[PDB]
Amino acid sequence: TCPFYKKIPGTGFTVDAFQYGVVEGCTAYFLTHFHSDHYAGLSKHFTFPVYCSEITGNLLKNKLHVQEQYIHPLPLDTECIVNGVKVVLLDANHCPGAVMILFYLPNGTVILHTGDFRADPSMERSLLADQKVHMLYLDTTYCSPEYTFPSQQEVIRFAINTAFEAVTLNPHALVVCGTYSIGKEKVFLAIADVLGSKVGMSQEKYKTLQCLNIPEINSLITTDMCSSLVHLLPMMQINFKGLQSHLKKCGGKYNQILAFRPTGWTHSNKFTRIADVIPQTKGNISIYGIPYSEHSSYLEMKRFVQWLKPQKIIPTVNVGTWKSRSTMEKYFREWKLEAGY
Ligand code: NI
C-alpha cells in the first residue's frame, strides 16, 4: 500500500508510486526521473496515464517498453492542465530528464515536489520566483551538516587533469569509468573529450544514452571497444579483480588502467580535500573514488529552503527511522527560526 508522502491531497495524483498495484483514487501517475527505486513496478503491461519529461518518456518506451498510448511527456517551464489541475515541470539538476513538479490545487494551495534534486541558486530565478509555496515534499538524502562535498565543476576539473596527465605520461594506459544508472555522464564525457576519444560501452548502455537528448552524442560514444581508450563498465566490475580481467580482454593494446568510481558522499570527505585525493593501487591498476553528487549538500539544501520559506515540509528520503525523522525535524526548525518565516 502506497505511503502518504507519495500522494498529492486534493487531487487524483501520485508521485513515484508504481510498486503498490492499482492505487485507489489515482487517475494520473507522475514519474520524476528514471532511477529504479522511483520507477519500481512499471512495464509493458501498465495501463494508466504516466506523466513525465520527454527524456523520461523515451526511456519508458525503449527500455521498459511501456506502450506509447500511456506515456504523456510535458515540456519544461510551461503551465499545463492535467485532469483539471494546473502543473509545471522544472529541471531538478539531478540526472537527465529529472524534474520537480509544481501543483496548483483547486483550493488555492501550492505544492512543490522536488523529486530527487541538487539545489542551486539558479532555481531562485525559475518560475518559483513568482509565488508562495505552502507544502514542500523534499529530497532529504543529505540532510545533516556532516554531508559536505565539492562542486561538480571542481570534481570534473580533477578528473580531466588526472586522466590527461596519466595518459600523456603513458600512451598505453586505458581509462575505465564505472556506472549503474543514468546520471553523472559528464565524468566519462569530459575525460574522453580531453583525450580525443569516443567512449566505448556495451550495446545496452549505448541504447540508454541514445534516449537522453544529449547534443552531438553520435560524435561522443560507440560500441566499438577497439576504437576507444575510455571504456564504461558496470560499477560492480570497478575493483582489482574485475579490472585485471578486463585488461586481459584488450589484446595487449594496454599495460596500465586508471579507473574512476563516481560515488556520492563518502566519510573520507570528512578529512580529505578534492585536490589531495589519492587512489588505491595494486600493480599496474589504480582506482579513484570521486565525490560527484547529483543530490544537494546540506548547505545547498538549507539555502534553497530558507529562500523558498515553505509553511510545511514533508521529507521523501530517510523516512524509515525515528532517529532520522527527529534529526530532520530539528534542522527544519533551526532553519525557520534563523530566517524568521
Ligand atoms: Ni535519483
Please tell me the distance from the alpha carbon of residue 212 to that of residue 208, in angstroms, as a whole number: 7
Domain with CATH 3.40.50.12650 in the chain: 148-295
Count the Cβ atoms, other than its own, within 10 Å of residue 163. 24
Q: Which fold has domain 148-295?
A: Rossmann fold (3.40.50)
How deeply is 216 buried, as exposed, middle or buried, from its count of CB atoms within 10 A (0-12, 13-18, 19+)?
exposed
**DSSP single-letter state for residue 337:** H
> Ligand 1 centre from 95 Cα, in Å?
7
How far apart CA 142 and CA 70 sit, in angstroms, is 34
Distance CA 131, CA 79 (A): 14
- Closest-CA residue to 176 (of 245, 222, 238): 238
Distance CA 85, CA 107 (A): 11
**How remote is the CA of residue 35 from the centroid of ligand 1, in Å?**
5
- Distance from C-alpha of 18 to C-alpha of 226, rounded to nearest angstrom: 40
Q: How far is the CA of 143 from the centre of ligand 1 (A)?
A: 15
Q: Do strands 99-104 and 85-91 pair parallel, antiparallel, or not at all (unpaired)?
A: antiparallel
Query: Which experimental method was this entry solved with?
Result: X-ray
Ligand 1 centroid, distance to 117 Cα (angstroms): 8
Q: Are strands 230-234 and 173-179 parallel, antiparallel or unpaired?
A: parallel
Task: Cell numbers for 149, please give them.
Answer: 562535498
In order of 33, 56, 59, 83, 204, the CA distances from 63 in angstroms are: 14, 10, 5, 27, 9
Report the chain's C-alpha Rg in angstroms.
22
End-to-end CA distance of the chain: 35
C-alpha cell at 176: 575505465
Residues 126, 301 contacting (CB under 8 angstroms): no
Q: How many residues does the chain have?
A: 341
Q: What is the DSSP letter of 286?
A: E
- Amino acid at the residue 177: C
Q: In this structure, what are the phi and psi dihedrals at residue 204, rounded to the nearest 5 degrees?
A: -60, -45
Residue 196 CA to ligand 1 centre (angstroms): 31
Which residues have C-beta under 5 Å from ligand 1, the single-atom ion?
35, 116
Q: Which residues contact 332 (CB under 8 A, 6 or more apart)?
A: 305, 313
**Type of residue found at 156:** I
The CA distances from residue 80 to 70, 75, 89, in Å, are 17, 9, 9
Distances (CA, A) of 123 to 114, 118, 120, 151, 307: 11, 10, 6, 16, 10
Data resolution in angstroms: 1.2
Q: What angle do CA 201, 207, 208 make, to 5 degrees?
A: 95
Under DSSP, is residue 263 helix (H, G, I), strand (E, B) or coil? strand
Angle at 299 (CA atoms; ends 330, 180), nearest 5 degrees: 105
CB 280 within 8 A of CB 297: no
In CATH, 1-147+296-341 is 3.40.1410.10? no
Contacts of 43 (CB under 8 A, 6+ apart): 64, 65, 66
- What is the whole-number distance in angstroms between the Cα of residue 235 and the centre of ligand 1? 16
Separation of CA 144 and ligand 1 centre (Å):
18
Non-local CB neighbours of 235 within 8 Å, separated by 6+ positions: 178, 179, 180, 261
Measure 181 CA to ligand 1 centroid, in angstroms.
9
Query: What stretch(es) of the chain map to CATH 3.60.15.10?
Result: 1-147+296-341
Of 261, 260, 264, nearest to 149 by C-alpha is 264
The C-alpha angle with vertex 149 and arms to 143 and 151, in degrees rounded to 5, equals: 115
**Secondary structure (DSSP) of 186-249:** HHHHHHHHHHT-PEE--HHHHHHHHTS--TTGGGTEES-GGG-SEEEEEGGG-SHHHHHHHHHT
Cα–chain center distance at 91? 11
Q: Are 16 and 6 in contact (CB under 8 A)?
A: yes
Question: In terms of DSSP bridges, do strands 280-282 and 221-222 run parallel, antiparallel, or are they unpaired?
Answer: unpaired
